[PDB]
Structure 1
Amino acid sequence: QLAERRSMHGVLVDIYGLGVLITGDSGVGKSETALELVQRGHRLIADDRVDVYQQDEQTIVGAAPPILSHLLEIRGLGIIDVMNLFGAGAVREDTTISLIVHLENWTPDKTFDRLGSGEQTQLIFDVPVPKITVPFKVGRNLAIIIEVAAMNFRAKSMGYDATKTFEKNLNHLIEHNEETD
């Protein structure tokens, strides 16, 4: 059942069951982050280069190109076999891709999403995949930002919206605020 496979530059991981594709300029360290994510119990699908294909009108599947399966490159140290170092519960052949966390250089040209309200999207072979964009700032904990992006995406999809919750009690809060006397 083998359809077309385009190719994408990033890191595909599976965080709490969600396929999350990390993209970015180098000098951020997508893959250092990959590794820290596998220390924390998540699954590596592909490093650096990721095969994707369409499967439904609303579903993409990502995988590593067979040749690179299980392989991870640490600019510096060398190349490792993640399965050998971390075992089978650390790697997966594929996942659907629910979310792109695009890693962006913190320049104060333009701005970022401060409510979680934005709904940016990135088209991959017909499917618009939900995307988000976090500032990079040398020694942010990125693993954790990605972990939270993932958790918060599943929450919203399930009807727990934090953004909405806060728009909803903005007035009550302002009312309690001003009462600073």
Structure 2
Amino acid sequence: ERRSMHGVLVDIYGLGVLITGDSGVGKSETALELVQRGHRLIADDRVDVYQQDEQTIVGAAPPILSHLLEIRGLGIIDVMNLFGAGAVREDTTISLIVHLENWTPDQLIFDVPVPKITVPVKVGRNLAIIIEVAAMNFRAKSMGYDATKTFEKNLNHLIEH
């Protein structure tokens, strides 16, 4: 079977990232900068997921929404038109989700245990780049590169200075 979720599904560095968060927070706008930044859009506002394996989930946009993105202030926008074929992608695996929230103090998952992170929304923060970094990073670990390793490496430096 399949299901539907809110949020926009972009493709960053070939990494399926599903941006989620209470309406108005800035998911469509952020996905627009990401697309403008060379990344691929799959689904905006509403996403149709269809689990492929027991560890791999796929998402896509409902037929009507294809190649489209709404943005409070300009309304519906065809990214294919404005940016060319490299701004859209039919389907993709959701390898990570980013929940855009707001403010408080501070390795989650979701609907079929999928890597998830939550970033706060506040003045002076480019969500587009933070999501770009979030992806680069997630990808970096998969290869073994971790902040912890570098951190353990720095610690030696002192001990053995």
TM over 0.5: yes
| Per-residue CA distance 1:154-180 (angstroms, 9 max, x = gap) | 11011111223214433535887xxxx
- Of the candidates 66, 88, 92, which is equivalent to residue 89 of structure 2? 92
Choose 165-174 or 6-15, whichever is displaced more.
165-174
| Per-residue CA distance 1:96-121 (angstroms, 9 max, x = gap) | 1100011111234xxxxxxxxxxxxx
| Per-residue CA distance 1:71-107 (angstroms, 9 max, x = gap) | 1101122111111111111100011110001111123
Find the aligned partners of 2:128 and 2:12 in 1 and give their Cα distance.
10
Find the aligned partners of 1:54 and 1:89 in 2 and give their Cα distance.
25
Q: Which structure 1 residue ranges, 4+ long, deviate > 6 Å from structure 2?
A: 122-126
Where structure 1 has 5 or more consecutive residues not aligned to the other structure, the ranges are: 109-121, 177-181
Structure 1 residues 123 and 63: CA distance shift in structure 2, 3 A = farther
Task: Tell me the CA shift for residue 26 of structure 1.
Answer: 2.1
The answer to whether the 8 A contact 2:108-2:117 is kept is no
Supply the RMSD in Å over aligned alpha carbons.
Answer: 2.2
Higher normalized strand content (fraction of residues) = 1
The answer to whether the 8 A contact 1:11-1:49 is kept is yes
Greater Rg, structure 1 or structure 2?
1
Find the aligned partners of 1:34 and 1:164 in 2 and give their Cα distance.
32
Where structure 2 has 5 or more consecutive residues not aligned to the other structure, the ranges are: none
Aligned length: 160
The answer to whether the 8 A contact 2:46-2:62 is kept is yes
* Pairing of 1:69-108 with structure 2 (within 5 A): 69-108=66-105
Task: Tell me the CA shift for residue 124 of structure 1.
Answer: 8.7
So what's the TM-score if we normalise by structure 1? 0.81
